[PDB]
Structures are given as C-alpha cells and as structure tokens.
Amino acid sequence: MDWYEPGEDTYTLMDALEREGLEMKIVLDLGTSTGVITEQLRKRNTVVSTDLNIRALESHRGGNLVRADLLCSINQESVDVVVFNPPYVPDTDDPIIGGGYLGREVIDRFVDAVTVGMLYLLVIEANRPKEVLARLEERGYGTRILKVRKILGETVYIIKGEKS
Amino acid sequence: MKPFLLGLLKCKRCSFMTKLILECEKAESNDVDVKIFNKHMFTENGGERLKSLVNSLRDFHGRELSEQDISSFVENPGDDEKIKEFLFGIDVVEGSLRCDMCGLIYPIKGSIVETVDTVESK
Ligand SMILES: C[S@@+](CC[C@H](N)C(=O)[O-])C[C@H]1O[C@@H](n2cnc3c(N)ncnc32)[C@H](O)[C@@H]1O
Numbered sequence: 001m002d003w004y005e006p007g008e009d010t011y012t013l014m015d016a017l018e019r020e021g022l023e024m025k026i027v028l029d030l031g032t033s034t035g036v037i038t039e040q041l042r043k044r045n046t047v048v049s050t051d052l053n054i055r056a057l058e059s060h061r062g063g064n065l066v067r068a069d070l071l072c073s074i075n076q077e078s079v080d081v082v083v084f085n086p087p088y089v090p091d092t093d094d095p096i097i098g099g100g101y102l103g104r105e106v107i108d109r110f111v112d113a114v115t116v117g118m119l120y121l122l123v124i125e126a127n128r129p130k131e132v133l134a135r136l137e138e139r140g141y142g143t144r145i146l147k148v149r150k151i152l153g154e155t156v157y158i159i160k161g162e163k164s
Numbered sequence: 165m166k167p168f169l170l171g172l173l174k175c176k177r178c179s180f181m182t183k184l185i186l187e188c189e190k191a192e193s194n195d196v197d198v199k200i201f202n203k204h205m206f207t208e209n210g211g212e213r214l215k216s217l218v219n220s221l222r223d224f225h226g227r228e229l230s231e232q233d234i235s236s237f238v239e240n241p242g243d244d245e246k247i248k249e250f251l252f253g254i255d256v257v258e259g260s261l262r263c264d265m266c267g268l269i270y271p272i273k274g275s276i277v278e279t280v281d282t283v284e285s286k
C-alpha cells in the first residue's frame with residue numbers, strides 16, 4: 001500500500017474522540033496519513049498533522065502538514081493534545097505499519113518522548129496494552145482505557161493519557 | 165505552511181529552543197473554523213518572531229502587517245484579528261526554515277514542512 005487507509009481501527013479512535021468532544025485545543029494528529037482524523041479534529045480545533053510517509057501527505061485531505069519522525073521537530077510545549085494511531089503490527093519493520101518486536105517499537109519510542117498534557121493512543125492486544133499503560137504511568141501520565149472494541153483481525157484499545 | 169506553525173516547530177538537533185528563520189520562495193494567500201495559536205511565541209522580545217516573518221515575506225503582498233500592528237499586538241494580545249489573519253491567512257508553498265543556532269534546514273515543498281530529509285547550511 002502507498003499509504004495507510006482508514007480502517008475499523010481508525011474509526012474506533014475517531015468514535016472515542018467524538019465522545020470526548022475535544023474543542024478549542026491545539027492538537028497534533030501524529031501519523032495523520034491522508035488525514036481522516038484531521039478532518040474530524042479541525043472542526044473544533046487547530047490541528048497540526050504529521051507523518052513519516054510523504055506519499056500520504058501529498059494526497060492529504062488537507063491541513064497543516066509536516067513530514068516528521070514522531071515528535072523530534074515538534075515543540076510539545078505548544079501542543080495541548082496528541083492523537084496517534086501508530087504502526088502497531090508485530091514482527092515487521094514496514095515503514096507504514098511495522099512495529100517490530102511486539103509491534104511495540106514505535107509505540108515505545110513515542111511513549112518515551114511524549115510530554116504534552118493529554119494524549120489519545122491506539123494499541124492492539126498483541127502490543128500488550130498493560131505494558132503500554134505502565135510505561136505511560138512511568139512518564140507521568142494518569143491513564144485509562146477509553147474504549148475496547150473487537151474488529152476484523154484483532155481487538156483495539158484506545159488509551160487516554162493525562163498529566164496531573 | 166501557514167506562519168502560525170512557527171510557534172509549534174523546533175530544530176530537531178538543538179536540545180533547547182532556538183529561532184527557526186523562514187525563507188520564502190513562493191507564498192499564496194489563503195481564506196481566513198478554529199484558529200488557535202501560541203501567542204507567547206509571537207509576543208516575546210517585542211514580537212521578534214513576527215518581525216522575522218514580516219521580513220521573510222516582504223516580497224509577498226497578498227497580506228501585510230505593520231510596525232503598529234505588531235507593537236499593538238504585543239500591548240493587547242487579545243486584539244489579534246490582524247495577527248491571526250497574517251499567521252493563518254498565508255501559506256508558504258515553497259521555501260525553507262533554518263535553525264539560527266545550528267543552521268539545520270527544513271525545506272518547505274508543496275506547502276509541506278520537511279523535517280526528515282534536512283539540509284545543512286553551516
Ligand atoms: C496505522 S497508520 C494510521 C493512519 C491514520 N491516522 C488512521 O488512523 O487511519 C500509522 C501511521 O503512522 C505513520 N508513521 C509510521 N512511522 C512514523 C513515525 N516514525 N513518525 C510519524 N509517523 C509515522 C505511518 O506512515 C502511518 O501513516
């Protein structure tokens with residue numbers, strides 16, 4: 001695939017975001033791909049959308065586009081919320097979907113760099129959601145599993161993280 | 165890229181905040197939904213970032229700011245109708261962002277800010 005296309009996983013993240021009613025924030029849509037989540041977010045927020053995949057950015061629904069590797073080029077002090085449907089697929093290092101060992105390599109890199117006040121992260125059962133929660137706690141985030149949903153292939157967990 | 169992004173981007177090499185300086189090959193005006201920006205980034209040093217942007221875009225006449233517009237915004241940041249219009253109402257399609265400390269360059273190509281495939285200038 002040239003870029004990651006909207007799937008049941010993305011729609012469960014979108015459904016959870018919808019119920020939260022995020023409004024009046026500066027939101028980073030990390031791994032925006034072609035911007036399906038950005039499209040929903042920009043209705044109530046100012047959104048910066050980033051991806052490693054230039055092809056997806058070049059066919060983006062539209063927004064404020066940055067090609068970047070996670071958050072290194074982002075000033076996190078300026079961002080209220082980060083939303084991330086990450087490459088979570090175990091045992092591949094495909095640049096779009098691959099999460100390598102446990103499907104957790106990008107997730108783990110993200111958790112160890114994230115400092116914004118609030119985050120929404122999607123994970124699957126194979127990533128070991130509890131280890132993700134734990135790592136987030138270690139980073140100062142109070143966490144909770146906003147939503148669990150079985151989809152075609154696996155079960156999706158939406159993690160909400162917030163600093164006190 | 166719209167200039168409000170200058171409140172959100174940073175050099176990925178320097179471990180402290182630095183100033184990213186804009187070079188603009190071409191820019192288009194954009195119609196001015198939610199427009200929130202990091203006001204403090206544009207107020208500090210008497211509106212340094214704004215002055216920097218105004219200089220970078222001096223050959224672009226689609227939209228404009230003035231000494232006064234900037235000074236007054238620094239006074240009353242609550243009155244940012246003109247600032248928002250400048251920061252959200254312009255899109256740099258072709259250009260560059262340069263870290264003033266290490267000279268790292270982020271090309272801007274087709275309005276996308278490229279922070280992965282960088283250029284050195286020092
Ligand atoms: C599973 S896809 C999610 C796409 C989209 N937001 C959605 O929900 O449908 C993960 C996305 O992260 C991007 N990605 C992979 N590694 C990245 C990285 N290191 N930094 C930023 N984005 C990355 C991929 O290109 C891909 O678009």
Ligand SMILES: [Zn+2]
Pocket residue numbers: 175176177178182263264265266267268
């Ligand atoms: Zn630098």
